[PDB]
Design an enzyme around this catalytic site. Structure first.
Site, short mmCIF file in Angstrom:
data_model
loop_
_atom_site.label_atom_id
_atom_site.label_comp_id
_atom_site.label_asym_id
_atom_site.label_seq_id
_atom_site.Cartn_x
_atom_site.Cartn_y
_atom_site.Cartn_z
N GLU A 56 0.83 -1.24 0.00
CA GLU A 56 0.00 0.00 0.00
C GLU A 56 0.84 1.26 0.00
O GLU A 56 0.56 2.18 -0.76
CB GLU A 56 -1.07 -0.04 1.10
CG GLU A 56 -2.15 -1.10 0.80
CD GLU A 56 -3.31 -1.25 1.77
OE1 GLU A 56 -3.52 -0.36 2.63
OE2 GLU A 56 -3.98 -2.32 1.69
N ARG A 67 11.69 -22.08 21.20
CA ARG A 67 11.43 -21.83 22.62
C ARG A 67 10.56 -22.94 23.23
O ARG A 67 9.54 -23.30 22.67
CB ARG A 67 10.72 -20.50 22.77
CG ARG A 67 11.56 -19.31 22.45
CD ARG A 67 10.91 -18.08 23.02
NE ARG A 67 11.84 -16.96 23.05
CZ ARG A 67 12.00 -16.10 22.06
NH1 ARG A 67 11.27 -16.24 20.96
NH2 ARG A 67 12.88 -15.11 22.16
#
Ligand SMILES: O=c1ccn([C@@H]2O[C@H](CO)[C@@H](O)[C@H]2O)c(=O)[nH]1
Lengths: 239, 241, 242, 248, 251, 243
Positions: B77, B165
């Site tokens: 955009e 993680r």
């Protein structure tokens, strides 16, 4: 020999840590002779090697042969002898209309259209040149009064179908590569060659520096300079 | 508006061709006020946009949100409105023992652990920064007395399992990402973040320039925010000079 | 805060186990005010959170932002605070000419055009909604006298080329996505949105419940560029908590 | 015939639009006999087919054989004859520790561990059952006082290595499938069978409805294959009840 | 039984180590009866099995069903009972314009368009037949005066979209298989069938011998499926050829 | 020259339709001189070519260089000059303990650990040799009193990590290739080399015949670092095919 293919010993390199790696065994002498005290080291298979001196320091020059598999052997065995820096000098065909015959392309990173790069990292890893060596190559260009095309190169395991050539015995291009030239063109890709994706992916993953400079022989839409630049680039890095 | 998500028209940009693109909308005004005559453009969803002037030239500051998908909307955009240069600034966590907190990382290229990159080019294509912009970033660091770590970044679609993680509800990491941190570490990869692969791949394929700088905020093996925002503003100036 | 991004603690949730998860941070307040005692909790980055009460039961309303990466953070961190059920409410582009702007689509399962999903399970794993939660969404539609348009949704990591939009700067789409809208159409796929593949694959693999209802804002057989949905997802929450 | 494998003509189906599709040709007659006026239609290769009537409505019962490739031929040829709804009734190995032998599982969607599904859609497409038909199966379970396990099924092109069985001649499993039962387990996957991924993908993409119920014959946390020590409402009775609901 | 599907014990095979594996349970008897003392063993699901004697040695004949997943169960269970050599006899659609209805095709290797083969090795592994068994099949064709067509075969998990058949309910084929027939035709691939990729990959990886011969029933450059107009079968017989190949190998 | 790399014209080949293709340019002369009237054609880059005669029949001998990419250029350019049969003669590392240094392996088909093969066909296509040429190679071993190890070969784009060699600078092998040697061993694969998967896939798809015999120089069950047996076989095999 202390390495199985090249026919070299670590003593033969006189402490060289930088290599210039053309594709063609027949170009190695002429590159060597642009520097001081050029001397023949060995010749076996596609691997012709010379030593020479740049502003005092040893430089090994050694051919790779065409394609990633023969390149990956040379780079590994050179590194076993203490080489940590690999400057590729070469030939290429441009695929952008604004990249003229005789021009110079410095490859920043490559489309991985090869198989050997996958022997070092999965495809998600970028085939990216060392920033310092790419910088040296660009500055060597501008010293020569040549503003190089800096960008992405498509690096193919084939000269024919993977570069979407139809001028062959069968005239056929497999589905994967049918329409592919226009696809790379649309994405800004500058040229095709056949070693940089392996060279880049293997040095990045193993902790060595690499870069690649090439003179444009043909443009698909329509080389002393290149060797002189790579030697200038080597002297910048060794300074 | 000209553009459906950002709520901007081309006239609003006053001719800007360069955007600074932080991840957090709340950091936008802060970056903008390092420059002159900061002025609110619009705020919709996670997209907050300002215009400021860098050594007299118009610059857009616009947030992306976290991740490639939201980033890909902002960049397209903005580019519909004449922006052609996108500089990403942020905070990151390092995975190499010698990348200390308060160091700076300039990402030259990225491991594509994302999905939106593949909406621009097949995986063979490198997720590589613009050389000119990366050069400006590195010069900006050195002007400030910082020698940046320059290298490869792993760019993940997740904060948790894709960065391997285990401090999560299930504590599980799917097979693909099990042992993956060590694999990138061994390849010299410097850090994890979550936008650069999308940003780099979309810009390289669509003809726009991109780059990425980040201050190290944590190291998985063991003032800096201000530093990184200062550096990206200085690189913008260099590029627009 | 007890978590890395959201700015929330477990105590702030008053024991809620169910979240309504809109894409847009600016819709969270409106959603919460359809319930009782709506209370602002936090706002950080794209994550605005309110708490409200449904028939005496606390419900947390939290935005995800656009796309799977932001969604994966909100879902994991809310699950850290004891949420086990995630009802997404969104907007969507219809790709079947029979679906009108203003209609509602209940997504039973998703084409995985995203990358976060693969950080939970390999591509062979189905991006499927929870049966109980989908059931509740369909019922809430029936109560409201609307069609629930239940089926498959293409969930894309991009708004432009991955949804085969061509009104863009370059006007091109990469090979993989060229022709892709026609392919989904022919396969009876209903619509495009940008969160459900990641939401579903992550909840399904991690033992949580999820479902997704969205308001149709554009029909792609006509054009590229473009409250009911929100009342249905509130109705569904009530059914699940009853 | 008017199709190439099954040996059937449209007239033989007496307007049936719904099929029950077990894997074993030897189960077809027994399923048909739970309905009215059971009549043999054809038998060729692994495809045995009967007609019967469900609360006055015609139903074709046709076997698929084991695996997606044989199933895909069945489903295509039935659909040529006007069938638009396919209810698979099968047997299954449970992979979660308290899904017991004799329980029934209703498959909502499947892990695509098959090749035939890829001949209908790329792997990103979900192998998901029809919501209407899955709801009827759930309803038929509850009517019978059986609460079914409802969830995700691993649907495999092999009975041995792809289900991580090791009691085989080589006792080896290829790298892709080594440790794969634990991955599906951790993900909440309920069971293994060998036809649902192909059936669901081909039906969703072609505009037909499908569903899958199966009885557990072994729990893989216990045994690789059942024996006389394994524990002794049928899935066949459930699928016939489900069919009645859909055609009402 | 000693195995879970086939209904067979080791004793019932009378020491047999070579199996003929047709796709169709209904062909098993006929094959068996080309040899000596043919005897019905068992029939369960798609698996019909007979025993017979080739020049005095026991041969098991067992159906596989259509497709790799059924094939994979039969091959594993037979090997549990001591079979080490698997000779597939089948039917096939020719995709080259002058491979005619009634010719025989000996498959030397297979395009892997199945999923069961990946359950034995990654796609980079070749689906290739045993050299000795392929050699015996070729020799059996030449003894019979039939020059076979030896080459590569596309082996598909489907009969319809994966073989690019369009005379179907939707008349569409997914993107991956659209134009695929032309791709295999250009590459010199001779035919389609539905078992050989799975059978070859599992046999090569597990240490067993396999081969595959098949009679052409349609030519796909002519018709999607055969009808009464299609060329009628000659006395050339893939079933005779497979039996003759078995005898060469057991001799 | 009427081709882009080899430096050859059709007229130079004297009507030859079969090539023997070793990897090493220095092997070309040695192979040619096993035949009659050995005649230098050209030498460019890694591509050295001779013409010689095999029981009266012309045969080109042309190196490929190491790897698929260089192999792909030579095969295509020869075929442009009328060559339709390609007999590869090479060296190899054995991965099965029963294979001794000095034995010969005849490769029926190859595991595709290369990238050039994908420039001709997607990965499901088998990297398989021509039946006739393989049979001629088996016969030539048999005539010489050597039992060919006929089987599957792993054909790799690298000598080091892709053949799971660890004695390297970094001593690391990427995830995809860690444990791969054992995987192939368990699947009965005989050996590693670096050209057959490209050669076989490009010939099979393009309408040309190809085969591959190699002498074992090392057994990887013992160590990582290591004509005229293999070369004698390929020449005997060429004679069989052109008779
Ligand atoms: O055509 C559309 C319309 C809306 N959305 C949804 O709305 C947001 C973009 O406007 C995204 O979150 C997505 O969920 C789409 O994906 N496609």
């Amino acid at each position: 020999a202390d390495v199985f293919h090249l026919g070299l010993t670590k003593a033969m390199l006189d402490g060289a840590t930088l290599a210039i790696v053309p594709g063609d065994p027949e170009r190695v002498k002429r590159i060597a002779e642009l520097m001081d005290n050029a001397t023949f080291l060995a010749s076996h298979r596609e691997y012709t090697s010379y030593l020479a001196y740049a502003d005092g320091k040893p430089v090994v020059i050694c051919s790779t042969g065409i394609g990633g598999p023969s390149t990956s052997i040379a780079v590994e065995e050179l590194a076993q002898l203490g080489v940590n820096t690999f400057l590729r000098v070469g030939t290429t065909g441009a695929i952008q209309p604004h990249v003229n015959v005789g021009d110079v392309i410095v490859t920043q990173a490559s489309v991985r259209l090869d198989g050997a790069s996958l022997h070092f990292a999965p495809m998600e890893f970028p085939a990216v040149a060392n920033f310092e060596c790419t910088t040296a190559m660009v500055a060597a260009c501008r010293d020569a009064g040549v503003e190089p095309h800096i960008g992405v190169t498509a690096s193919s395991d084939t000269f024919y179908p993977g570069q979407e050539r139809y001028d062959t015995v069968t005239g056929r291009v497999t589905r994967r590569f049918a329409g592919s030239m226009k696809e790379w063109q649309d994405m800004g890709v500058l040229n095709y060659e056949m070693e940089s994706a392996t060279l880049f992916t293997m040095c990045a993953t193993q902790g060595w520096r690499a870069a690649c400079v090439a003179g444009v022989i043909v443009n698909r839409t329509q080389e002393v300079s290149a060797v002189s630049i790579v030697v200038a680039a080597a002297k910048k890095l060794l300074a």
